[PDB]
Amino acid sequence: SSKLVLVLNCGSSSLKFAIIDAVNGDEYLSGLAECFHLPEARIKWKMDGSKQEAALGAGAAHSEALNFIVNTILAQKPELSAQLTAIGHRIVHGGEKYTSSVVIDESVIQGIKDSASFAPLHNPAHLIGIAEALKSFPQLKDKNVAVFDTAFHQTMPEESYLYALPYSLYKEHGVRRYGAHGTSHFYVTQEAAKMLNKPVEELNIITCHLGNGGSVSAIRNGKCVDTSMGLTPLEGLVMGTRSGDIDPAIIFHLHDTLGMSVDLGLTEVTSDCRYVEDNYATKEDAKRAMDVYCHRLAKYIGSYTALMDGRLDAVVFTGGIGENAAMVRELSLGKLGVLGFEVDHERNLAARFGKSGFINKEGTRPAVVIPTNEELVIAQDASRLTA
Amino acid sequence: SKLVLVLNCGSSSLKFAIIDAVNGDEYLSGLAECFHLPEARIKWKMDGSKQEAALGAGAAHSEALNFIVNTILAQKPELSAQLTAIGHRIVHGGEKYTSSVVIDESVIQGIKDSASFAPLHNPAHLIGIAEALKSFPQLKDKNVAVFDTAFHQTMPEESYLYALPYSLYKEHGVRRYGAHGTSHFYVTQEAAKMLNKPVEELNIITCHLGNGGSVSAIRNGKCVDTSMGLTPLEGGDIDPAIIFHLHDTLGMSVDQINKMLLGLTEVTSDCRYVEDNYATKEDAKRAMDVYCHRLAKYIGSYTALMDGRLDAVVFTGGIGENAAMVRELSLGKLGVLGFEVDHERNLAARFGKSGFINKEGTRPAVVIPTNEELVIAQDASRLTA
């Protein structure tokens, strides 16, 4: 009746996980293990309607987190464990070789190893996740599935994916642009079509995934035709600064100027284990970074009018920041008055903390907040490919 | 009538003109090139026929200037006598030089100290100054520097900062400085005239295309953002994929990325060959499509600087002034913005002719031939009066 999938998303400092029924999206477990390789290493999870938290021990990382999942969390619930039909892994880079999700075998693992040069920070983490998954769940060893953040973007034509350099760069070396957060962009695209009550294959939108890293895509007739992760150029390359190492007063200021003050994606985004792009010395330094970010965000959105062929249906906001940071949406859209955008303050405040909705003034260009669910898409793909 | 010798000295070439600063009249123009090579040569136009001569094997800046003085002007002592000033194109003036300046010892040092930002240009400019001081000793106190970066110094920090730790700016001055600012300046002044409105109220996006162009956002007559140098249509170690990624996402040249992280550079250049480098129709089309796609994206990106109002897009430069299909193909992508090109107007506005190329009733798009040499003559005359 149900097809439960264990979903693993390993990064350089954390591991986000869930158990999800791929048939209807029911969540049986979700959580976040974070502050890896530090004294503060910890794990937060939600199960049977209740939130829980434990220390993983000083210096713990992925192996330890998975151990705690199997021997503490799932040890209480062997019945849950028994239901698992597959494991889905979120993988940053699949290049041109893997343009859709795929069952993991030794050559897929080799493909991931060979892609170390793309988001290198998270590369070891993905592999450790696969290695530990195979060990901890020997019964599912032929039913691990890789789901690639580049895959959705494989529809980009060459005018979009080529660098502004000699064609030989691509012809001889295969150097090329690829795209980030593809599973999220994919998810919000399918959802936008429902919210706008139209066929996905007629959908022209611009999608802004603002989370761990920030990317913007141009969707024409339901397919990605251009994308950039230039909002956070160093994401996946450079550690950045742990939020908890910054003066708490600076961080409170950042969170409040973002528009995240009340009046899973959210737990991650406000975490003192989240890494940020600069070691802000002052409140002013933090605000500057935010203003630069909103300026660049507005430019990306404007730039993708060049992909819309005369029709733009909506701009979509998603991810830890996009779903919750009302001021990022206000300030970025507020720079695009010439395109007929106008943010409705009350609508914008309401579309936070997991609530979806339109944030435009009715009668002006649609702007929409759609909480992403990368874990569900990974579950659906993992279940579909192992059935 | 106030004649100025205008020089733009590069590592392997020297562009020159004599311009009446009062009315824009041109008395001489030319280009010396293939320096440090067997084929070093000079082409010029005067009275008003086109000529060319070899400068001699290995010749460079000193020979080029010697030729101007002793061959081109030897027959025109009255032209030589009417020279009132010399204006020099300087690629990088950093944050210090926000307008044109009479060259003295401190300006020389300014140019030197900031060579790191433009290591292949600023040094050649200095040779040009040194050689001009020799070749035109009567004008020794009347040399003026005009900076390609000056017009761009009105950019606020939200535009000029890269998406990098703030220490890179604070400690090392890593920042957008802009390119072709003398051209963006010029077409901004002219656009206000074509649109019949004050320059202080002008919101436009200016596209200097040609010679590694750039696109700027002008709000209330001032530059508020500008692009990196575009690639012209001829287009133990960190993985190169990361370098290109950083280049593309930051908007920083491959060289400035590596940096922040006897011309060999011209030994196989075009001016060396009689025949041409082959380019297939398919490869030419691909290059065109990539260029026009990226150009349209820049234009759309700068709607985010316009604060609700975009008066016009402006095209200029050797490509922008002349390439009808670049304008049609790039604007063709921006229907959302209300752009639509009229083919016949588009074809009319070429080869030195200005005009509107938009369809009547659509967002204005204008071709304005740039005149950087006039701006340089104007500044040089004004500042030395």
Residue numbers in the entry:
A (entry chain B): 2 to 264, 277 to 400
B (entry chain A): 3 to 237, 245 to 270, 277 to 400
What does the publication say?
Acetate kinase catalyzes reversible transfer of a γ-phosphate from ATP to acetate in the presence of a divalent metal ion. In the present study, we report the biochemical characterization and structures of S. typhimurium AckA (StAckA, NCBI accession: NP_461279.1, residues: 400, molecular mass: 43.3 kDa) in two crystal forms at 2.70 Å (apo, Form-I) and 1.90 Å (citrate-bound, Form-II) resolutions. StAckA protomer consists of two domains with characteristic βββαβαβα topology of ASKHA superfamily of proteins. A cleft between the two domains forms the active site pocket of StAckA.
Another crystal form of StAckA (Form-II) was obtained in the presence of citrate. The structure of this form was determined at 1.90 Å resolution using a polyalanine model of the Form-I StAckA monomer. Although the overall polypeptide fold in these two forms is similar, residues 230–300 (variable segment) were in significantly different conformations in the two subunits of Form-II dimer and these conformations in turn were different from that observed for this segment in Form-I. Residues 277–287 of B-subunit are close to the active site cleft present between the domains and occupy the space where ligands are expected to bind. B-subunit of Form-II represents the most closed state while A-subunit represents a conformation between those of Form-I and B-subunit of Form-II (data not shown). As the residues of the variable segment are also involved in the formation of active site pocket, Form-II structure is not suitable for binding nucleotides and therefore may represent an inhibited state of the enzyme. Examination of the difference electron density map of Form-II StAckA showed significant uninterpreted density located at the dimeric interface that was distinct from that of the polypeptide chain. Citrate, a component of the crystallization condition, was found to best fit the density and could be refined with reasonable B-factors (33.9 Å2) and occupancy (0.75). Interestingly, only one citrate binds at the dimeric interface resulting in an asymmetric dimer. It interacts with atoms (distance cutoff: ≤5.0 Å) of residues Arg178, Asp227, Thr228, Ser229, Met230, Asp257, Thr258, Leu259, Gly260, Arg309, Lys312 and Tyr313 of the A-subunit and Arg309, Lys312 and Tyr313 of the B-subunit.
